[PDB]
Every structure is written in C-alpha cells, then in structure tokens.
Ligand binder design. Sequence first.
Ligand code: CU
Length: 215
Amino acid sequence: EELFTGVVPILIELDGHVNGHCFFVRGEGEGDATIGKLSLKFIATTGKLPVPWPTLVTTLVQCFSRYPDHMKRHDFFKSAMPEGYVQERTIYFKDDGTYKTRAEVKFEGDTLVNRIELKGIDFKEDGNILGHKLEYNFNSHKVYITADKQNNGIKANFTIRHNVEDGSVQLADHYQQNTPIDLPDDHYLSTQTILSKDLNEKRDHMVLLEYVTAA
Ligand SMILES: [Cu+2]
C-alpha cells in the first residue's frame, strides 16, 4: 500500500526471442497507483522489432492498478512488496504462434523494476503477427483474477482483441500465474490503453498511457 502512495518510477526491460529473431526492449516512465495511471516510453534498442508493438503491450506491472478502499484487502500485487512477485504467462494467438514468458517484478531502490524473458514459437510466416498486419491501437479488456492458494499465488485469464488492418481481429489467449518471492476473492481489472508515438524520437519506439481499476 504505502509503497505506492505518491508517484513511483518504473523501469521495464524485455528480452525477446521469436522464431530465431532477436530483440531487446527498454521502457522508462512512472506510475500512480492511487489513481491507476501509467505513463511509459519504450525503445527497441535493437532496431525495428520483428513483431508489431501491440503484441508486446500486454507483456511489458499490475501492482499499479487502482484498488478502491473497499477492495484494498484483495490486492495481491501490492502485498508482495518490496520483495518481488514472479509473473508467468502463456499466450496463444489464434491460428498464429505462441508466446511463453517469465518476469520478476520488484523494487530496486525506489524504482519499481520489471525484468522479462520472452520466447515466441511456431509463428506463421506472414501471418498477422510476423506480417505486421495489426493496427497500432489497443482496446479495453477485463482481466479476471482468482486465487491459487496451493502455490501461494494468483491465476488469471483474459483474451486480447487486436485490430487487424483489413478490419478483422486477432485474438490472443492469455493464461497467467503470479507467485510471490495475500489472496483475492474473484474479481477483475478493467484496463484502458492508448498507444502513441513521440515526434522527437528517431529510434524505434512506443509511448503508452494506461488506466486500470479493479472490480
Ligand atoms: Cu536474448
């Protein structure tokens, strides 16, 4: 709780391998967990990414979600601090390839840091992902959390809707395990996101603003 009153600096570092391709992504910014606001800039320090930016958005700190006082007792992510929880995920793109990921989220000094390993496999050649055919926007989604207990963590479930350029939609099935390095009765996070760019950046990048509240 108290480690998130005020505004906290965020550092996100990603390690990506998809179909033999390679990338590293670094993001700075800050979060305000008392109103659920995130602001972040990400740079692909290894030139043009091999996947479209919005596939990585879900993957790149839920501990910045806003919990109503009446729900403060059900916030897992904050309870596991300043020590760090591990976020594990599996992501199926329908009829297109998979992401499997592991991440440690923890405080380092006064910075909340999130360090991430990613593998991406079986992704179709010139499918929507490897073919960069998704629109550069993000939609709203609900993230259904539930207790794990038998491994002192939480699980999660949601489906991301991706806008394809022609007008169809790429579905991305997420499964999630978090585990500490507290338990919540079944609720969900309501997520809202805006993908932008910075007209004074040359490098390849993404600006991201986002609001999340629990219900
Ligand atoms: Cu690597």
